[PDB]
């Protein structure tokens, strides 16, 4: 039976080496696309936090196993508080909603769908953050061939920054 096993081991060994080679080649050809994707999204992240004035970071975690490939969102809203993970323990629901809406508007240019639909953001939060987000989207939408964006605010505020591309409607 061990001679039969000697008969059966060569094909299994060549299968092992071929599978290892195809694994390493697939990882090598997959690294650049995910690398450029995460670099672009981190650049947009930094740009939008420069526009709003707050602080935050995003890094891609690459463990040895690809099953646990995770992406982290490190936002630092408070000056005294250090860098913290996006969770309900560090910040309240308002900062979490702000992070979610900025992450949504960040992936707008990469998505093939034209319009972005969001609503119910000013629920018990300061409208200054939403006004800054709207003015940043306006400043980013001055170029030609920009993705459509639908913004619905539960409340309004006067004395804000307006543009020539906005129109009041019901």
């Amino acid at each position: 039976e061990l001679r039969e096993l000697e008969h059966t081991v060569p094909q299994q060994s060549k299968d092992l080496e071929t599978i290892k080679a195809k694994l390493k080649e697939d990882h090598a050809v997959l690294e650049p696309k995910l690398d450029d994707i995460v670099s672009k999204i981190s650049a947009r992240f930094a740009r939008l936090f420069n526009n709003v004035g707050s602080a935050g970071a995003v890094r891609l975690e690459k463990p040895k196993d690809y099953a646990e490939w995770k992406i982290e969102i490190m936002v630092k809203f408070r000056d005294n508080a250090p860098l913290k993970k996006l969770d309900s323990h560090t910040q309240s629901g308002g900062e979490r909603a702000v992070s979610t809406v900025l992450y949504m508007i960040a992936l707008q240019e990469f998505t093939s769908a034209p319009f972005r639909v969001v609503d119910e953001i000013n629920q018990g939060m300061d409208s200054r953050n939403e006004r800054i987000v709207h003015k940043a989207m306006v400043e980013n939408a001055c170029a030609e061939n920009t993705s459509q964006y639908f913004l619905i605010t539960p409340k309004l505020l006067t004395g804000l920054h307006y543009h020539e591309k906005m129109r009041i409607h019901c």
Binding site: S13, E17, E61, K62, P63, K64, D65, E68, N80, P82, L83
Partner: protein
Amino acid sequence: DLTEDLAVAKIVKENPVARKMVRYILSRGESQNSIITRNKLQSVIHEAAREENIAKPSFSKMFMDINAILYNVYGFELQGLPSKNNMEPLGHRAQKFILLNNVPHSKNFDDFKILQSAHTYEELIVTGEYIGDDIASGTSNTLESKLSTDRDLVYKGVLSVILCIVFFSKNNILHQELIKFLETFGIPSDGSKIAILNITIEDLIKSLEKREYIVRLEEKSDTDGEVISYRIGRRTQAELGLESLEKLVQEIMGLEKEQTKSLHDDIIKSIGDSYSI
């Protein structure tokens, strides 16, 4: 002291290019604790000679003058790395050099500095924290502390523990063996970033083998696949002397000084074929 110091002032005033090259070597060796090769030395000395329009002097005399300067001003000495294929140290013939002092070590300063470092460590990582933006108080380093990096010190500790592991591994350790060693020590190898090192284990070991502190051996076969062994670099052999490793192991054991005898032979037999001497 005035007679020896005045002699250095005469050989320094004779050629400022000597000062230039010795300060360049000092900077290149102290900025990233890196190595210097011979060809780089000839290139920089030729650049200095062409800049200061002075004919190139000899090599042995220049090396001796640089050694004397760095030994009388800072106490260091540019030690040459012996060749691997050939193996008397090649002072003016080796292709790799490294700066290192040749001073007899003290016996109380180490204890005081490690006691101060322990007094600090009692405050650095309280409740599994780290100083910096996490700690409210801004004077995290207490404005005075003999650690100076707070990042490379644990790196040197990991380097030393790896050196001891390979030493007691008959100078031949397997990749899986060191992986499981780091696992049982507590450092994971699943790819997560270390909270203090801020780097993975594979990047750490590749930067270490790039730093010439460990030499890798690759062997190809049919039933073993890709086996990788690790060897001790020549830089470690030139840095860690016999008395140095003896003091290291006697501090690691933490026993009395009366039992120090009969242990040198045990250490020699446990390190295996690690020194060419």
